[PDB]
Write a protein that binds this ligand. Structure first.
Ligand SMILES: NC(=O)c1ccc[n+]([C@@H]2O[C@H](COP(=O)([O-])OP(=O)(O)OC[C@H]3O[C@@H](n4cnc5c(N)ncnc54)[C@H](O)[C@@H]3O)[C@@H](O)[C@H]2O)c1
Ligand SMILES: NC(=O)c1ccc[n+]([C@@H]2O[C@H](COP(=O)([O-])OP(=O)(O)OC[C@H]3O[C@@H](n4cnc5c(N)ncnc54)[C@H](O)[C@@H]3O)[C@@H](O)[C@H]2O)c1
Ligand SMILES: CC(C)N(O)[C@@H](O)C(=O)O
Ligand SMILES: CC(C)N(O)[C@@H](O)C(=O)O
Ligand SMILES: [Mg+2]
Ligand SMILES: [Mg+2]
Ligand SMILES: [Mg+2]
Ligand SMILES: [Mg+2]
Lengths: 340, 341
């Protein structure tokens, strides 16, 4: 039966007179640092010599190299890409982590691969948010939060749990709920969402677009209906709240509801369910782990090629034309990560 | 080449001294009425004797039966279920529509089936929002809007276009963009989104859940990842702005981006593409229209059974357990349709 912490199950008392080193200032790193600072937690950023170092400085943080940040920290949050954990842990973190210090990862992958390991007299934990940085930041400023999974991997102090949930409360995850889940299960779940579900959702959107265009439909209109209007995104996000079938029952015309229920449960052949199983096998069996280590060569050169190639896919060409001709409701993001 | 109207291409001048009758006060009707009123447009609500009649009165509208609303209107917006258009048009609208008055539908279906037809001396148009009511209302209050398609079917007055785009501006669609598209194409596009894409997206999420749970994954965790956390919804909504592949390039860890690009373009067998074509054939060929007419029997008895059955699917059982255990960042939808500006 599930262990789920909300605000009444956590306090910031464990962070009194303690310094948190946020290692990295990327998607997660920047949100953690901003939210920790605004919660009145003593925070510093450890970063290599790149644009993220300069960004952290521009946003008013105390920024040093990783080793110096760790040496002056009671809690260390390793929020850099997972493939870089091994080298940074061995060289920068392990030699500099004080007696009784807590190390946290936001993904179980480095723990699964043994790249991050328990150290004598130190604590090791996972606090893995179920959301990217901008929403974590916007939710936090609105007195809300995103969910997270946590796992106490090594508790040598006997205070690891209090300190992890104090970080979770400070960054706002306990406003949603922080559930106990093994780092191994989090890794496979998380990679499954990225490798099966996200690609398949976009593949299906893209399939809808290309079929409509092949059948002589206005390409701007095709793009808007399949996602460009924000309607399908809105359905899915409202669905997260009240249920996906429920959203259609609440917000769909009777015409829409009859159409939806005609094909609901009938659209996908068994081959999709089998592909999902295949993706899980690759994740659980080390095939993906090997693939990711290869792809991280030449600083993710192959990924840079894939990102640039995707921009010329018909869906993405059609998107650029639609977004040039239709204004989308956005929010000003200027100074979003500056002190509140 | 596409004809797209934004604020600078429309004005409220055509609505000066004119009354709009909003027929229905449902998902679309309530948002149209709220936004029109807030934009300074004289609005009447026409409705049968049901809860929507009472809600419209409670929210401070002038509410009568449909015939009386039409009789006292310059512009009539028929915002009731599409299968009800034919009878309401024949009995309530056609006999009571003033000379030079405009009738608007928000879906091309009744126009395709011949249930709504041009009337001598009157205008007929489609203004079809690409969004449901609550977002249309929320966007409006933020100085934003949702896109729409429009079509001028009949233009006796020679001012049908001016008046339709005036409505579109008052309800906020011109803040996004209002594109010219034929009612027939709008019908087929709209039904395709509802019958292929929406079912397929939820089937995909449900398959994700089923496979994780069947292999011993925590059901709450499985539910949260496939949509319950709001992450996939946020990805698709941010994707609407900057692009779906671009959201991953911007917001995904390198671990995430390498995983995504490994299977992107490779997840679906050819059978999914073929089913999309089949759904489009059923829509274009009259089969769905016949199915919808049959389904609208006993006031949508089958739909009521399907809605209640869907509550008992494992995904929806898991959803209720997750939502009791995790607090979701919602917006107080209470007060949404209260008078503004
Ligand atoms: N729901 C959407 O988001 C959406 C999107 C764009 C287009 N549309 C179109 O807008 C129109 C209205 O759809 P909706 O989703 O708002 O519907 P809805 O189910 O919310 O409509 C309910 C309203 O219709 C009235 N009504 C129901 N049956 C009636 C009957 N037999 N006679 C008279 N009035 C009756 C009710 O009294 C109530 O006012 C349709 O043409 C639909 O295709 C809907
Ligand atoms: N991105 C998300 O939304 C998300 C969600 C939950 C969990 N996570 C986890 O959070 C962690 C950070 O992911 P992210 O998406 O924020 O990453 P990111 O790509 O945004 O990380 C960029 C940051 O990492 C640093 N960095 C990059 N390569 C480095 C190297 N070789 N050595 C040292 N520092 C290096 C950069 O200087 C910068 O500060 C990962 O473990 C990831 O799995 C990410
Ligand atoms: C909410 C749906 C998907 N709308 O786009 C309308 O077309 C409808 O028929 O309900
Ligand atoms: C944004 C994604 C989908 N996150 O959920 C993270 O797990 C990641 O690895 O990026
Ligand atoms: Mg991840
Ligand atoms: Mg994730
Ligand atoms: Mg529709
Ligand atoms: Mg629609």
């Amino acid at each position: 039966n599930d262990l789920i912490y909300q605000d009444e199950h956590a306090s910031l008392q464990p962070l009194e007179g303690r310094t948190v080193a946020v290692i990295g200032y990327g998607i997660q790193g920047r949100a953690f640092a901003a939210n920790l600072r605004d919660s009145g937690v003593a925070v510093r950023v450890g970063n290599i010599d790149d644009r993220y170092f300069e960004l952290a400085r521009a946003e008013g943080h105390r920024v040093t190299n990783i080793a110096e940040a760790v040496a002056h920290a009671d809690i260390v949050l390793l929020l850099i890409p997972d493939e870089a954990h091994g080298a940074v842990f061995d060289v920068d973190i392990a030699p500099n982590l004080r007696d009784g210090a807590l190390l946290c990862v936001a993904h179980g992958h480095s723990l699964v691969q043994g790249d991050v390991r328990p150290l004598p007299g130190r604590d090791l934990a996972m606090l893995a948010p179920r959301m990217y940085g901008d929403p974590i930041r916007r939710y936090y400023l609105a007195g809300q939060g995103a969910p997270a999974y946590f796992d106490i991997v090594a508790d040598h102090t006997g205070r690891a749990r209090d300190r992890v949930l104090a970080i979770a409360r400070a960054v706002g995850f306990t406003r949603a709920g922080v559930m106990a889940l093994g780092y191994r299960q989090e890794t496979f779940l998380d990679l499954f969402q990225e490798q099966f579900l996200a690609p398949a959702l976009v593949d299906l959107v893209e399939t809808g677009f290309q079929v409509l265009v092949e059948r002589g439909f206005n390409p701007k209109a095709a793009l808007l209906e399949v996602y460009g209007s924000g309607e399908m995104g809105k359905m899915m996000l409202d669905g997260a709240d009240i249920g996906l079938d429920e959203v259609v029952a609440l917000q769909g015309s009777p015409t829409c509801q009859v159409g939806y229920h005609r094909w609901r449960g009938r659209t996908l052949p068994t081959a999709v369910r089998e592909l999902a199983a295949r993706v899980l096998d690759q994740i659980e069996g080390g095939d993906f782990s090997a693939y990711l280590k290869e792809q991280a060569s030449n600083d993710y050169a192959s990924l840079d090629d894939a990102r640039r190639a995707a921009l010329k896919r018909p869906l993405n060409v059609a998107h650029a034309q639609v977004r040039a001709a239709f204004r989308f409701p956005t929010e000003a993001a200027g100074g979003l990560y500056q002190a509140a």
